[PDB]
From a paper:
The Saccharomyces cerevisiae Yta7 (yeast Tat [transactivator of transcription]-binding analog 7) is a chromatin-associated AAA+ (ATPases associated with various cellular activities) ATPase that maintains the balance of nucleosome density of the chromatin. Yta7 is type II ATPase containing two ATPase domains (AAA1 and AAA2), which is conserved in eukaryotes and expected to assemble a 910 kDa hexamer. The AAA1 is an active ATPase, whereas the AAA2 has no ATPase activity because of a lack of nucleotide-binding motif. By cryo-EM analysis, here we show that Yta7 assembles a three-tiered hexamer with a top BRD tier, a middle AAA1 tier, and a bottom AAA2 tier.
We went on to first determine a cryo-EM map of the Yta7 in the presence of 2 mM ADP at an average resolution of 3.1 Å. The Yta7 structure is three tiered with a spiral BRD tier on top followed by the AAA1 and AAA2 tiers, has a dimension of 150  × 150 × 135 Å, and adopts an asymmetrical overall configuration. The active AAA1 coordinates an ADP between the α/β subdomain and the HD, and no ADP is present between the α/β subdomain and the HD in the inactive AAA2. The six AAA2 domains form a flat and symmetric ring at the bottom tier. But the six AAA1 domains form a shallow spiral ring enabled by the six well-ordered but differently configured linkers between the AAA1 and AAA2 domains. In the ADP-bound Yta7, we identified four ADP molecules in the AAA1 domains of subunits A–D, a partially occupied ADP in subunit E, and no ADP in subunit F. Interestingly, the entry to the nucleotide-binding pocket is largely open in the ADP-bound state but is closed in the ATPγS-bound state. Based on the density feature and an AlphaFold structural prediction, we unexpectedly identified a 30-residue motif in the N-terminal region (Gly320–Asn349) that interacted with the BRD and referred to it as a BRD-interacting motif (BIM). The BIM is cradled in the U-shaped BRD burying a surface of 890 Å2, over 30% of the total surface. The bottom (proximal) BRD is located above the α2 helices of the AAA1 tier.
Author numbering:
A (entry chain G): 1097 to 1131
B (entry chain A): 410 to 735, 752 to 940, 1319 to 1379
C (entry chain B): 406 to 734, 751 to 939, 1318 to 1378
D (entry chain F): 757 to 813
Write the structure that this text describes.
């Protein structure tokens, strides 16, 4: 099933939001350490 | 990164690519005022290592990558097509949507002749689908965005002719093997970040020596000369298994390292067949300069190379910078009708005896015509590719000679070419040259060895108009043979203290810190020259080079002797 | 890519605009007339023509022009076989969802650009991956359920690469040939592209551009106007090409002159020159004294052969304007009899032009093909036959004749017939002669062959006897004394010019401003008469090639001393050359 | 430029044709020569190497 959900257009959109969410989790860990 | 100051030559293309990448983004009100769109797609074509990927990368990362960043997608044509049956079209669509969402973008298809070849073979139907989705995707005349498609290839006739149209690839840029000034600029670019930079007379001699080189070959030359200088100035760091023997920079890349890199680096123009365009070598030049210049004069008469005061084709932007403008109508079309009326039918048939240096004269003439589009109809240039017939290859070479208008159709070894090439494609080439207008600048240069004139006025080449334009290479004169045999004498008269032999060092290599007159009367020299000219009576260039080689072996064999009586006697004994 | 381009943006396709209004817009406004006869509107056109003609422009203008009211027409667009993936699934499923969403938004236009890659011809191998797409396309276009008001438009370069089951009523019932535009349509395209401009061009300059752009498509005319504007920007403001910061320019006094278009015509290679056949173009202005006396005769002969200037029937440029401006008026004996007696004027149009070796046939053929503007030229020369390396000679000849059989005003063009009958195999001439004798008499396929020193015995009892070249042999005789006199009179007019009239460019005395960032000519009239008499007496019984050789050889001598005011040395060199 | 051009002038047109009677040990002489010139780059042009690959002519 996930071979059917993982399609390269959605894969490239998910690498875009993967670098976005990698940056999001990094900023959120430093935010929960500073606050 | 790479900017426009890392490119040697190609300033016309730098000024012409800025009106479709930089100036659309920078000046969007001067392009909206005329309701125009930038062309949006270029076909770079030329030999490998000429600077196509460098031009694409400079055009990406040079035109204002500060707030309006231009992204860059580098794809190869063999990368897009895969082993499946629908992957290539979908991957092209994914690349074009990815370039559409990042809107100022440059897609670069390197070696696009693999992705979209010409339709003359290759069933199983998938290449027609890939070509059709490529043609429908790079529609540059319905405002798909700000995508610029740049396709690099070796020769533009290996690309599908449907892509060489407006809307698709509009402009085609020829990226040539660089001439002496552009090789000077390239060698200055590569030797600019050094610590001890080379002089001007150094780079001039390097540009003169590197004949038939490209940009990548000059880069490898500079890299290998630097490596030889590290290998020579501090040779102790190689064999020693110990730790860092640290060393300062007194390194200087002199002549004896570039001269080894020149024989260690082979160019990519030593892989293409036929005559590589280069001047006459320094040995055979007194045998063939005086007959070359006349040919140049003939080529200066029938082609208007010196009096081209109306066709001075450089970047016309520079013409608008340094000149200014000017009934007023007639002075354009009348003088452009009488200016193109000088080229009537440029034909030339260099025809001499067998072995009379025609493989040098062809290369020297092609080196004289650097600003032309040389299309080689040599045997090995046509029978090498199996994807095309001889017929279609000859027709496509003629059509590329017809599109780029200053062009030379060059047929080396015409006496073989009228025997191992069928009469069908010879008559095809005759009909193609007969359908040209007279004011078209397509020179037909043919070089033949011992061709009969009965084939020229009555044979298969009778419909090519070689009636007055036959130049006859003759055997060299006695005053030319006397000057040709005047480096053997200056090798007979060099004493063995000047011959660069190898002598072992009496002291070993240090280690750093751990943190007579030669007996030769002028009568002997005169008798050697007299017998050496008396033997070479009514000889050709190949026979003269045979005598030159066979005497040079005798001279260089006894190169440490100080009494040259045995060498002189062996020279006279051979030439008898 | 679906802009505001309407029907006033397209120029020269006014007949297909009426039919596309007839099958897209007019069913929406008037459903009572279509239901009066119980007819469905025609739905689905295959646009085909040369590349750069206006197919995608017509699709976008049909999508945007009929939607100006509050009756919206969605425009689904598909590039050519971008719909298929590496698995077997999504290629048919995405077409299913496309036709379902076109069914949902009911007035819709699906535009298949480059449909020859989506629906190819059924070959010998690799059947599955395209036949499984052609099957679902055929079953979705004209299936059992009503598709709705989905107008399917396809676009291609050649229509034979599409499957023949698609070229069928219900799917692709109309097939529109978009032609490379004539001089009126090129005038209208040049008027359309230079309409927004602040300083517009004159009418006669656009007329001279329309004459100078023979062979150009619409996209080539757009590229010409774009390059003319870019050269005007380079000419007015060069300094923006040197700075990296945005200088302040004003978008006035940047008007496009004639000298910018005259350089854009040299920078632009059209789609006629990219082809391998003989490009149709008029006689050049140099040799027009030499040949236009005996080209005009040929035109008169063709006017008696093809009925060009006698056009009362088959004048269908636009049927709707024909029904608007004209007026109707037993039934057989007023229509069919007169249509037969108007079509029975073309009997067997053949023409063999035969002159000596070098007598300007490469100009006469192109001038005749320029005169026959409304015809379809099919080049049967050697280069076009052997250029496609996959085809054979026989298959290329049969393909070109079958392409000439449709679009019936057509010219089969064989230049260099003396080479053709010596290097084509003998069975191909018999194949072409059997194709020509299996035609009706009233078909307007002209056979135009140009030859150099062809023997009449080969067209009398030879291998060209089965083409009926009986009365239709025109002899290009060598040019007479007065034509040579006018030719060399233009040469003499070059000679007696002043060096202040010879255009040398400039050297500017001052540099360009930086921008704020944000004697008498001595030539006696006796020497002119001596040079003219020597040029006339030297070129006795010469052809056009020898005359061009003498003309080039004398023009080199004249352009040598283009700055000298004492023209006695160049007169002496001219008389010394012709001896 | 002088000594490299007079050292490269010692090869003029290197050609050789070994011709003997039928069966006079040519298949050994050729192998011994191609072993002697082992620093070179041998391009065989015999029939077994040209007709082997079926794609190229
Ligand atoms: N005209 C040039 N000027 C300066 N350097 C060049 C030029 N052409 C090539 N080079 C060098 O060669 C490399 C570019 O090779 P590449 O762009 O791959 O050639 P091609 O595109 O012909 O394959 C760059 O690293 C550059 O240093
Ligand atoms: N008949 C025409 N009238 C006006 N403009 C045209 C015409 N044909 C082409 N053009 C111009 O050429 C451009 C490109 O046409 P294009 O859609 O590429 O045609 P094709 O798809 O047949 O190559 C369009 O933007 C249009 O402005």
């Amino acid at each position: 099933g996930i071979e059917e959900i993982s399609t390269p257009d959605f894969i490239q959109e998910c690498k875009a939001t993967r670098q976005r969410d990698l940056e999001r989790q990094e900023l959120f860990l430093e935010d929960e350490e500073k606050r | 990164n790479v900017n426009f100051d890392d490119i040697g030559g190609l300033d016309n293309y730098i000024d012409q690519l800025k009106e479709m990448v930089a100036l659309p983004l920078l000046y969007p009100e001067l392009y909206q005022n005329f309701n125009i769109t930038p062309p949006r797609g270029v076909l770079f074509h030329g030999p490998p290592g000429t600077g196509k990927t460098l031009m694409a990368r400079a055009l990406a990362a040079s035109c204002s990558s500060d707030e309006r960043k231009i992204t860059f997608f580098m794809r190869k044509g063999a990368d897009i097509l895969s082993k499946w049956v629908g992957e290539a079209e979908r991957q092209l669509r994914l690349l074009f949507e990815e370039a559409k969402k990042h809107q100022p973008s440059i897609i670069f298809f390197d070696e696009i002749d693999g992705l979209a070849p010409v339709r003359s073979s290759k069933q199983e139907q998938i290449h027609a689908s890939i070509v059709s989705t490529l043609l429908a995707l790079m529609d540059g005349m319905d405002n798909r965005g700000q995508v610029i498609v740049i396709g690099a290839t070796n020769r533009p006739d290996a690309v599908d002719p449907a892509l060489r149209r407006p809307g698709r690839f509009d402009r085609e840029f020829y990226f040539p093997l660089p001439d002496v000034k552009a090789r000077f600029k390239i060698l200055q670019i590569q030797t600019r970040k050094w610590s001890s930079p080379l002089s001007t007379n150094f780079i001039d001699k390097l540009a003169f020596l590197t004949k038939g080189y490209g940009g990548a070959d000059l880069r490898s030359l500079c890299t290998e000369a630097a490596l030889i200088s590290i290998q020579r100035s501090f040779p102790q760091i190689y064999r020693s298994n110990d730790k860092l023997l640290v060393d300062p920079s007194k390194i200087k890349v002199k002549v004896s390292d570039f001269m080894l890199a020149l024989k260690k680096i082979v160019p990519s123009s030593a892989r293409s067949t036929g005559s590589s365009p280069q001047p006459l070598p320094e040995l055979i030049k007194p045998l063939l300069a005086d007959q070359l210049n006349n040919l140049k004069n003939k080529l200066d008469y029938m082609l208007n190379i010196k009096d081209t005061t109306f066709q001075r084709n450089t970047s016309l932007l520079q013409n608008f910078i340094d000149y200014e403008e000017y009934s007023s109508f007639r002075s354009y079309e009348f003088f452009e009708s009488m200016a193109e009326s000088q080229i009537c039918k440029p034909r030339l048939l260099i025809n001499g005896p067998k072995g009379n240096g025609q493989q040098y004269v062809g290369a020297a003439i092609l080196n004289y015509l650097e600003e032309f589009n040389v299309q080689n109809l040599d045997l090995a240039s046509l029978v090498s590719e199996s994807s095309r017939t001889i017929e279609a290859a000859v027709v496509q070479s003629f059509m590329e000679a017809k599109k780029r208008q200053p062009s030379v159709v060059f047929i080396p070894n015409l006496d073989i070419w009228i025997n191992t090439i069928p009469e069908n494609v010879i008559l095809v080439l005759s009909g193609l040259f007969r359908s040209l207008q007279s004011n078209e600048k397509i020179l037909l240069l043919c070089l033949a060895e011992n061709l009969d004139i009965s084939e020229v006025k009555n044979g298969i080449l009778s419909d090519f108009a070689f009636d007055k334009n036959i130049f006859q290479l003759h055997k060299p004169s006695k005053e030319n043979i006397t000057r040709y045999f005047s480096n053997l004498i200056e090798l007979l008269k060099t004493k063995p203290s000047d011959i660069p032999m190898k002598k072992r060092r009496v002291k070993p290599l240090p280690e750093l810190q751990k943190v007579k007159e030669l007996i030769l009367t002028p009568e002997q020299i005169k008798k050697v020259s007299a017998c050496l000219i008396e033997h070479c009576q009514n000889f050709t260039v190949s026979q003269l080079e045979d005598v030159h080689s066979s005497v040079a072996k005798i001279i260089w064999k006894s190169k440490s002797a100080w009494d040259k009586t045995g060498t002189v006697d062996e020279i006279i004994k051979f030439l008898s």
